[PDB]
Nucleic acid binder design. Structure first.
Lengths: 129, 129, 129, 129, 129, 129
RNA sequence: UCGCCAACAGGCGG
RNA sequence: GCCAACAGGCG
RNA sequence: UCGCCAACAGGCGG
RNA sequence: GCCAACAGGCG
């Protein structure tokens, strides 16, 4: 068994799908990267640790690049015009059972489900109103 | 129009659904809370701000409580045995178009989609392996 | 739900009723006003916040115009001679369930029911005796 | 006449009705309490004073207790788990006629009528939106 | 109802129309923006406050951008060559009835009607004479 | 050209129209007023200047009389209770061509078109909600 | 709260 | 960068 | 007399 | 608690 596999980060239909694959797992930090120029790749990292006697903390990070071609001195390189950075921390007490955790996940999925406040606001360069 | 409405945070079928409703929107921080004892309620907050000249930062927070009844001196109160805390920060450059933002959202949704590494690990009190 | 709708503030039996409607939502503070100049309007505002660790506090304010000998749409000075202000502050411990809160509301309705001491005193420009 | 009479604070349909009765008028503060131990009683107080040279102010307070039986030192005592506090102040100009005042009373009654926004939000442990 | 709706800021006859939509209400400042990158968007904001004891002030702002594509560090980014800023403040006495206010709105509309002096001068890059 | 001519400020459909006419040109500042006492008149002033090296600024001011319960030709005090003031400041970068300026004007007309948020709010003595 | 200026919900002088 | 009782605390 | 907070006819800042 | 070029920086 293994959950350190490749997965679809962005489901753009069934073609423009962005897939990330395991690239490194050093010092307790799992890292996935999309194919082609690392300079223009999507990045995802995840790590867990006992933040305290009663808490376990997950630290997840995602990088979404804006693909672009930089030309300097007639020399063009594939780069990222800029990057959007997602940084989330999830703290779960050691008393949480699997059911409790399943719930926490559902909460996260609902928070970002299509149509809900937060995702709608983000997807539209907007805030809450 | 308004996106500061109530929504389903947890989709437990069509019955045990956890819904959060707008409760307060002070100092640029939108806050939703589930019904009944505030002591045992789910909490969600969201806020946006220009973190820098080129970046806009979203700060989202979710609290998942473990419902329990505390009895002290024969007096019982509805409380939360403990709480799981989710804290995420999303940084998006001002050059991002709506399409760019739609993508970012998709990335977030995919990261937590059922079956993928991160959600599976969390839902099982596990890390990456 | 979605409670921010217009409602009848003063019920005079269908004819001569005073309806108050949404006029503002800045800072999460809900506001309703009658179809009058701001100086002669009926105003209602409401807001909720966690006033402390154990309490939540609702702040309700109402402004009622002096109608006897009033000149509709005119300039009436001094303002203090033509207006009554009601300030309500409801503190509810975070342990209060929905049921508990229903009771609290009832208590408030009972306090002001027609024929009871308080409303009777007020309506008669008197105190208790 | 005399308006210092007992009244039903909480109408539960004849059964489980909370009634408060005159209990004190010391220092010009009219007081009513439910037929309970001073520690578990519902409390209503009211007072009027000529605040300014042209204003009269009514100060009304209501205390809704959450009855419980606590065990202190191995002995059982009737107590209140917590209390909900309603504090309201009403300022009326001396130029207000009785009709002017009836208007105020009506507005307060309408403000809390079943089905209206404010009472709905309170009873639902939520804000207005 | 709810007046926080999207509207057409620039009417170009159905084709090339600039529309702005609600994007934020944080800190009591209603905001609308065009479906663009935050860097090239049209922006409209509005707020009301009780300036004096007898005045209400509306503060409206509109930003008209001159879209362009700049090359920074060999990379192309969506930017605004420059922006035109409209800042307007409207102070209305609390004694103004709704009809009084409609008068104001009409005057503002007439002030900028096609063919009238002011809009003519502005559109011609000239003064009045 | 020669734009300094009279025009209809408030269009009430031919009958009851408010026309404003040239009344002063001192210091290049154009002024228009309705046929009223200066205290009850409709006033409009406009002027342009190079506010900075890159910008030109138009300053438009409008004064609208409170009409409800007004006494034509009478002395109405305090002035602040009977008048509304509109101050507009339009900043236009020196690069703006005539075409650009036409667009800016359109944006201004759209902002105040009948049925849109801003004018609707103002006309109703309300804010955004 | 008045006068200015701006890169525009900000800055300077009153 | 970390911690938390989580719109808060320390480097 | 205005803004807060409370264990609520009391406390803090104006 | 914040910022970022983001498994990093300052209180």
């Amino acid at each position: 068994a293994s959950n350190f596999t490749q997965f679809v980060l962005v489901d753009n239909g069934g073609t423009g799908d962005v897939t990330v694959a395991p690239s490194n797992f050093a010092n307790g930090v799992a890292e996935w990267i999309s194919s082609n120029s690392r300079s223009q790749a999507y990045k995802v990292t995840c790590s867990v640790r006992q933040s305290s006697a009663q808490n376990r903390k997950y630290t997840i990070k995602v990088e979404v690049p804006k693909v672009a071609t930089q030309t300097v001195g007639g020399v063009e390189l594939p780069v990222a015009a800029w990057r959007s950075y997602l940084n989330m921390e999830l703290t779960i007490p050691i008393f949480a059972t699997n059911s409790d955790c399943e719930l926490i996940v559902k909460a996260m999925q609902g928070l970002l489900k299509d149509g809900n406040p937060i995702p709608s606001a983000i997807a539209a360069n907007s805030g809450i109103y």
